């Protein structure tokens, strides 16, 4: 109905990256994904892959019964090393984007304050101008502390 | 006005197993088998689409 924020789901509409943002100032909607950390994630994610795939490959029935032994081991050996990095690929994701929260609670300060759900309503009105600076990591706050300090009044 | 931080979702029906959990649907993964026939490895994130 409305939109979202993390807590209750991811964003089908955001396609520019794994992680990223979207804003609604009075101009209009528009999903904008974070190239910043979507990249350095993938790079490591990519590095986890080959690091996994680097491990693939090192009396008649004796030979067979052995052949089937390491057909057995290796095949579960893999299964072992699949569930592992899979789970920890997935704590790596959720980690990053709570890190992509500290993102600007260490920047948006007290100008918006947690809606709870993972969104923010500004004591400001933040145009393209402004969300871009957030996205840039630019977001100053001598900005216009004052009005928000006033706007705070609410 | 508002700004939200979000993660990707899509219409992928692909699933993987983790140590802790089974058949989780995720947006993207690569299949390693160029034996027991179960070796999908995740690259994407947990697939949890909004709704509308």
């Amino acid at each position, epitope marked *: 109905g409305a939109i979202a924020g993390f807590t209750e789901g991811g964003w089908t509409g955001m396609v520019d990256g794994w992680y990223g943002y979207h804003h609604q100032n009075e101009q209009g909607s528009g999903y904008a994904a974070d*190239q910043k950390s979507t990249q350095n994630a*993938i790079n490591g*994610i990519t590095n986890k*892959v080959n690091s996994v795939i680097e491990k693939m490959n090192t009396m008649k029935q004796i030979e067979d019964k052995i052949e089937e032994i390491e057909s057995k081991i290796w095949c579960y050996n893999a299964e072992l090393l699949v569930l592992l990095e899979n789970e920890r690929t997935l704590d790596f994701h959720d980690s990053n984007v709570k890190n992509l929260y500290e993102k600007v609670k260490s920047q948006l300060k007290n100008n918006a304050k947690e809606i709870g759900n993972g969104c923010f309503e500004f004591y400001h009105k933040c145009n393209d101008e402004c969300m871009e600076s957030v996205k840039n990591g630019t977001y100053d706050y001598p900005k216009y502390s004052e009005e928000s300090k006033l706007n705070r009044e609410k | 006005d508002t700004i939200c931080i979000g993660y990707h979702a899509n219409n992928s029906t692909d699933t993987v197993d983790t140590v802790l959990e089974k058949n989780v649907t995720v947006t*993207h993964s690569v299949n390693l088998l160029e034996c027991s026939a179960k070796l999908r490895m995740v690259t994407g994130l947990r697939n949890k689409p909004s709704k509308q």
Partner: antibody
Amino acid sequence: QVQLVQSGAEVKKPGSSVKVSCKSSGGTSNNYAISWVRQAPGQGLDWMGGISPIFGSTAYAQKFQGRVTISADIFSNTAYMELNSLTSEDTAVYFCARHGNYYYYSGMDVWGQGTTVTVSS
Amino acid sequence: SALTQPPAVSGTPGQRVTISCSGSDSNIGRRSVNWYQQFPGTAPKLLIYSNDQRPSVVPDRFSGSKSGTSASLAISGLQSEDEAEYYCAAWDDSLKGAVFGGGTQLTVLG
């Protein structure tokens, strides 16, 4: 020292199909988006589509949609492009290109030698 | 094709000449443009990305600007080895695809 090495030139008669490979030699490009762009002889560049294997995106140009399949093998660091129902207009030189990042907005910074594909009865 | 380039340009050695690229709101208007170089029978090389940004190998004599719905590139101290065709490029959100200009053929005063 990464370089993209494409398969050699191929020629097939119309209505048949062709698969072109692009190997990332000297490293992997899996963490990058790779696009396929075609240049017909003495003509401009034309985006066909792209794939970002680890990211999980595969994209297609609208005109070539449904006729082209782009794929990657992460193990071999090789990306493949396959076109179907060839006609004379599909005769061209086909390049593989790597974007600056995981996505297609970024500039294409490593280019294959190019592969010539000729459609002739 | 979505992006607009003059078919051919000419310059004298040492002069500055500029080539323009006009798009619509769907491409350059909201996204960055990349432009490419082609010498005959060989693959392209990337000269500029992210509008005005320049790659490590490329000479400072190439430099860029883009405005509004159009972009243009100036080559200063034009030299003979520069003789080649260069293409504008951008992401298009309507197409959800990459687009290229028609291409511009540069000639150096013989």
